[PDB]
Design a protein around this ligand. Structure first.
Ligand SMILES: *[C@@H]1O[C@H](CO)[C@@H](O[C@@H]2O[C@H](CO)[C@@H](O)[C@H](O)[C@H]2NC(C)=O)[C@H](O)[C@H]1NC(C)=O
Ligand code: NAG
Ligand code: NAG
Lengths: 98, 88
């Protein structure tokens, strides 16, 4: 009533979700090639082997320990949701703006 | 390469971009004489009949030898291994 208004953003949340999903699919099915040219397919265990080789650990460390690494990754991903929910002040930076 | 401009700078970046990709069949290791060979630098590829080892950002197939492979293991624990002869 006093002349102060709030305008809506140009990008709706659905568009942002589509962008994030596109990035996730590209980085899962292509590795890092989709950010420098045409997307080139590659199996995921081979991509993990090359990411292991990037940090100085040979490839055979992964191929002989695939199941253990997969289980560790799954458990680490699973714990994230409970960590986010249980902590009360996890998203403080985004709340301070509002 | 840098260039000047009124109240600013202009960069000319040169970049290398791959193109004209091709499809291939790949395997993580090569079994031979009860030993598993892994590539040193490059991936394993096959046109349909024979096997080769090539680099990453370019298609340059080469014969598989023991100069560009290291064994380091056995042939019962890697998933997806495909046996083929490895020359010397
Ligand atoms: C896959 O690559 C191999 C290696 O180049 C091909 O084998 C050669 O094929 C040419 C074409 O007839 C022959 O002249 C050569 O003698 C072959 N090499 C050997 C060692 O025999 C093979 O043909 C390729 N696969 C396909 C489907 O073309
Ligand atoms: C590789 O094969 C897939 C399906 O078989 C096809 O969609 C794709 O275009 C092929 N790659 C190239 C570079 O043609
Ligand atoms: C090589 O692989 C084939 C196909 O998977 C398999 O049938 C064969 O037993 C393997 N060779 C040996 C010596 O085990």
């Amino acid at each position: 009533f006093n002349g102060l208004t709030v305008l809506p953003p140009l990008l709706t949340d659905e568009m942002i979700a589509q962008y994030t999903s596109a990035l996730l699919a590209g980085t899962i099915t292509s590795g890092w090639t989709f950010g420098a040219g045409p997307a080139l397919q590659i199996p995921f265990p081979m991509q993990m082997a090359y990411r292991f080789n990037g940090i100085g650990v040979t490839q055979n460390v992964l191929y002989e320990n695939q199941k253990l690494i997969a289980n560790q990754f799954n458990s680490a991903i699973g714990k994230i949701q409970d960590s986010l929910s249980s902590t009360p002040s996890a998203l403080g930076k985004l709340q301070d703006v509002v | 390469f840098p260039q000047s401009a009124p109240h600013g700078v202009v960069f000319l970046h040169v970049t290398y971009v791959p193109a004209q990709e091709k499809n291939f069949t790949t395997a993580p290791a090569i079994c031979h004489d009860g030993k598993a060979h892994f590539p040193r630098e490059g991936v394993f590829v096959s046109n349909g009949t024979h096997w080769f080892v090539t680099q990453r950002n370019f298609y340059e197939p080469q014969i598989i030898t023991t100069d560009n492979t290291f064994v380091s293991g056995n042939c019962d624990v890697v998933i997806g291994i495909v046996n083929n002869t490895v020359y010397d």
